[PDB]
Curated annotation (Swiss-Prot), chain D:
Record gene name: RPL8
Name of the protein described by the UniProt record: Large ribosomal subunit protein uL2
Keywords on record: Cytoplasm, Ribonucleoprotein, Ribosomal protein
Compartment(s) of residence: Cytoplasm
Major site of localization recorded for this protein: cytoplasm
Family that this chain belongs to: Belongs to the universal ribosomal protein uL2 family.
Disordered: region residues: 206-246
Organism in which the protein naturally occurs: Entamoeba histolytica (strain ATCC 30459 / HM-1:IMSS / ABRM)
GO terms for MF: RNA binding; structural constituent of ribosome
Gene Ontology CC, one term: cytosolic large ribosomal subunit
RNA sequence: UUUCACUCAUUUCGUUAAAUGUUAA
RNA sequence: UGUAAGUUAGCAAGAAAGAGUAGCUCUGGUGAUUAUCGAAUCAGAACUUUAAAGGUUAGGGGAAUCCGACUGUUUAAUAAAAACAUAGCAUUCUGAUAAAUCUAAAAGGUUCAUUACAGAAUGUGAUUUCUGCCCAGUGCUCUG
RNA sequence: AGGAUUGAAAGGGAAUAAGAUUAAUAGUUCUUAAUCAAGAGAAUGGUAACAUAUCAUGAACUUUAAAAUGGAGUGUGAAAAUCUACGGAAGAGUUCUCUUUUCUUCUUAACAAAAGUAAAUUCCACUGAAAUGAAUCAAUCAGAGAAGUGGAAUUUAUUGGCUUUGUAAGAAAUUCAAUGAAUUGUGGUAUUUUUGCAGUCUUCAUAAAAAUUAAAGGGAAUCUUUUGCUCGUAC
């Protein structure tokens, strides 16, 4: 249907090519479905900015504004895990 | 067998949800009308209240009274436990057979009171304790 | 086509000013004041609408029969039948675990 | 001249916060014995959207340790918390995401949010979406610890200040480019009346110190002392540098 | 207004002392025995004349009975 | 002569002023 | 039916340009229930005439130059614009007992139910491309 | 036990409808028919979802829900209006040129009942899907269990949505006679409005609170009749 304007073709021709290219990355990831960390189904959809709900699995998760998990919030979960192990042992 | 006569089960659904009952007769195949795996149980509908050393002798008898029930239940709506009662001690529960559960009509009140009376007697001696403690969800 | 008028002194199409035009004798159409749409009860845990309880106004449950506003089950009218089954398992299984964990492990 | 719009903002007449649909005050529970010598267990009932702020808010429900009943709190969601989760607050709480611990029991390099600047004040620092503070060092001599504020500043706090382990949810909120004036109009639905900002140079000499003449220009330096009286304090205050950085 | 369904409910209704007024309506096919009580106006639709006569025998004598036909009273 | 150590006016806060401090256990 | 240059590749575009359209009499397609029942819709064919959207309703088109990027707002009552706003870009200060700032004062007040992805103060005005040299003067700042 | 006053005749809220009547008031008067509040006189059934004209006790204390929550667009249930098919009854118009013709009426309330019978969603039992099925305009769903069969519940402008019934034909409408007589079937794969429902989309926007009510956990304790005040009400 379109050559290289995937979802931002709704913006038409009125916001600058670069600004439409930048928002395309976010808008694809904002409406996309994610794998639910409990029931492992691709059934998590965003409700509000930062809130994600597992549709057929009855859970609400706090996440990024447009993605379920951010990069910054992913290395923190591992960083705290390493410190927790070190604190317990010696 | 997990579900054998005398085994104490916990009901999960229905009016008797959360009551403790004693398995009487198991039938995993089911009858022609009973198209499911079912077991007959006799349980404590109303747990006895805790008594003290202050009330009159009449009250301590009334307070320790136990009201029981008899019901054919589905095996999927119960949770078998690790506790087993002595069916010979509870002789009035052996005689509860499947043919005694007539569909659509009230269960004989006289039979219920007989088991309710014995349940109170067995509890008064303190022989069985975990059976008669109410489950606090 | 018969055109009607508001009977009461309210003149705006608010939620509480809902009307229904019904027909009457002689071809005359009158104005009926229709009720608002209520919501039913919800499970306190999963927030799902319970079955067996009607969706009527809060004061109308006073006029309901005493058996028509609750379900004959533990936590009836406040919890779904699934909301209660997990409650029983939690109460029993956890207590069983605490008997082998402590108390002469 | 007149009073500039900056002066009129301090009166608070149409510049009051549009806080009607807000959920409440997001803070830790009040400090008590069970939070100082034991742990309390809280249940994350729900995660909700608070108007006017980017991070979601969690409705945590603690049992009342001294009386019979409940105790309903309103935390700021750490990124990762889910409904039905159990969180533990107290001096003995484990180092899991979402648990509230005194800042002195956390190892070096750990990441905390909603830190208390003064003990018992229920959260001051690192509260916005995606923000966090990192624990730098402890000092058992005077029971003080160092943390790095999200602005890069280093702050020293008493070691018994509480903090929630993790990252505030809603990260990356400001990376999505606003595109329409309408979208920026909707951003301040639960905020103050500040959005459509008229340039001072486009004003008239009465209204603003920048209100120019036959050509739109300022005419005098836009870097001012901190001690300028209100009304003429417009531009850059106590600026040590200007221009573009290389 | 409530409608009674069988005879034995309206035989019992009449022999009670709570009756207040009886109106009999004759129509093209049926006859309605609208007994006026304190609260409701119970009525019985009968399709047999012989059964209608039996009802008039059971009516007490201290109560007023009104007969209504193709012309309003 | 700033330089310190305490709190006792003083400042800023928190709660339902709900286990602070020292022993015992 | 056909449609250009240009283009942020989305548009330009109803581009431009050409043909048909009436009345009467018929034919076919699109379903439901097991032959009957129903829907206005599309296509086609002869014949005739005053050759048919036009009673009413109902876009003039093309080639360029300047300004503003766009949707929006404005001097009630002579200026609706190239002016204001706007998103984008950028600069400054502030760890909250703070910054800005109202008040004569105040356990006073606003942003603040807030906490740097925040608050406050400004310049330029979408996108692309580029922002050259100068710290002497006047400002501002300094760990001197 | 917990936080004082005011703040809405468009926000929330106990309960009334039809016909008639006046020179003028009428959900207010009259007739008829109802409703609400305040009073006065320690249970069964179903496997289960859940169900029983009050029934079938339930104090302090705590919790949950309702009141109470954006918008767009698509599909669809139902009612009314318009249009139309069959079958008539009564009256009117045209009629020198024809027209088995054109036109008008053929109705029904609040509150309740339960012959007959719908659409949609969510749950329950049996069984266990791959040769993957099921389904929508679009989607969407499934071994933390699909489709199939048999059930339960709620919503659909009052009881229970539609027809039907009591109300209630005695009213009202259309005619005829000089107060008295006549009739008041059944449909539609059409359009619009209203009213719900179902999922989809959208937000750096997430789209009120209290009065008030019900239920639960807990185990403390051992039909008839009376009244319903103040103020606005014309145009």
């Amino acid at each position: 249907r379109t050559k290289k304007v995937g979802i931002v073709g709704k913006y038409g021709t009125r916001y600058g090519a670069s600004l439409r290219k930048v928002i395309k990355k976010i808008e694809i990831a904002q409406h996309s479905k994610y794998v639910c960390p409990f029931c492992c189904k691709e059934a998590v959809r965003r409700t509000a900015c930062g809130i994600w709900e597992c549709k057929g699995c009855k859970k609400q998760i706090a996440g990024g504004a447009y993605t379920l998990s951010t990069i910054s919030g992913a290395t923190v979960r591992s960083t705290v895990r390493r410190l927790r192990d070190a604190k317990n042992s010696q | 067998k997990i579900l054998a006569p005398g085994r104490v089960v916990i009901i999960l659904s229905g009016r008797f949800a959360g009551k403790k009952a004693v398995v009487s007769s198991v039938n995993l195949q089911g009858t022609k009308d009973r198209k499911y795996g079912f077991v007959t149980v006799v349980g404590v509908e109303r747990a006895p209240l805790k008594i003290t050393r202050k009330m009159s002798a009449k009250v301590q008898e009334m307070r320790t009274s136990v009201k029981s029930f008899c019901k054919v239940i589905n095996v999927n709506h119960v949770m078998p436990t690790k506790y087993t009662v002595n069916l010979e001690q509870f002789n009035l529960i052996k005689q509860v057979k499947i043919n005694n559960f007539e569909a659509g009509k009230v269960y004989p009140i006289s039979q219920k009171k007989a088991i309710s009376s014995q349940f109170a007697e067995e509890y008064r001696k303190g022989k069985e304790s975990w059976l008669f403690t109410k489950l606090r969800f | 086509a018969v055109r009607v008028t508001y009977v009461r002194k309210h003149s705006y199409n608010t939620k509480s000013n809902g009307i229904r035009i019904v027909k009457t004798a002689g071809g005359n159409m009158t104005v009926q004041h229709r009720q608002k749409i209520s919501n039913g009860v919800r499970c306190g845990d999963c927030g799902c609408v319970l079955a067996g309880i009607r969706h009527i106004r809060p004061h109308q449950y006073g006029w309901l029969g005493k058996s028509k506003r609750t379900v004959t089950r533990a936590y009836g009218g406040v919890k779904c039948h699934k909301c209660v089954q997990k409650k029983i398992l939690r109460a029993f299984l956890i207590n069983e675990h605490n008997l082998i964990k402590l108390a002469a492990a | 001249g007149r009073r500039t719009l900056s002066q009129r903002k301090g009166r608070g007449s149409i510049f009051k916060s549009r806080s009607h649909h807000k959920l409440g005050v997001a803070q830790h529970r009040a400090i008590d014995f069970f939070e100082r010598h034991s742990t309390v267990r809280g249940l994350v009932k729900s995660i909700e959207h608070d108007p006017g702020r980017g991070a979601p808010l969690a409705r945590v429900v603690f049992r009342n340790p001294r009386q019979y009943g409940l105790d309903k709190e309103l935390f700021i969601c750490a990124e990762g918390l889910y409904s039905g989760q159990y969180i533990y607050c107290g001096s003995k709480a484990s180092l899991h995401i979402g648990n509230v611990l005194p800042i002195g029991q956390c190892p070096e390099g750990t990441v905390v949010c909603n830190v208390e600047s003064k003990p018992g004040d229920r959260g001051i620092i690192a509260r916005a979406s995606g923000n966090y503070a990192t624990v730098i060092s402890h000092n058992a001599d005077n029971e003080t610890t160092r943390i790095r504020l999200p602005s890069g500043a280093k702050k020293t706090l008493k070691s018994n200040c509480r903090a929630m382990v993790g990252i505030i949810a809603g990260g990356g909120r400001t990376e999505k480019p606003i595109l329409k004036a309408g979208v920026a109009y909707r951003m301040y639905k639960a905020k103050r009346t500040t959005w459509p900002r008229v340039r001072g140079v486009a004003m008239n000499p009465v209204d603003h110190p920048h209100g120019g003449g036959n050509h739109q220009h300022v005419g005098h330096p836009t870097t001012l002392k901190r001690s300028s009286p209100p009304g003429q304090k417009a531009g850059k205050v106590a600026a040590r540098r200007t221009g573009l950085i290389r | 207004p409530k409608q009674v369904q069988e005879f034995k409910q309206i035989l019992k209704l009449l022999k009670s002392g709570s009756i207040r007024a009886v109106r009999v309506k004759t129509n093209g096919e049926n006859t309605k025995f609208k007994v006026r009580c304190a609260k409701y106006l119970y009525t019985y639709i009968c399709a047999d004349k012989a059964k209608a006569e039996e009802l008039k025998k059971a009516i007490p004598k201290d109560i007023h009975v009104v007969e209504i036909a193709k012309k309003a009273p």
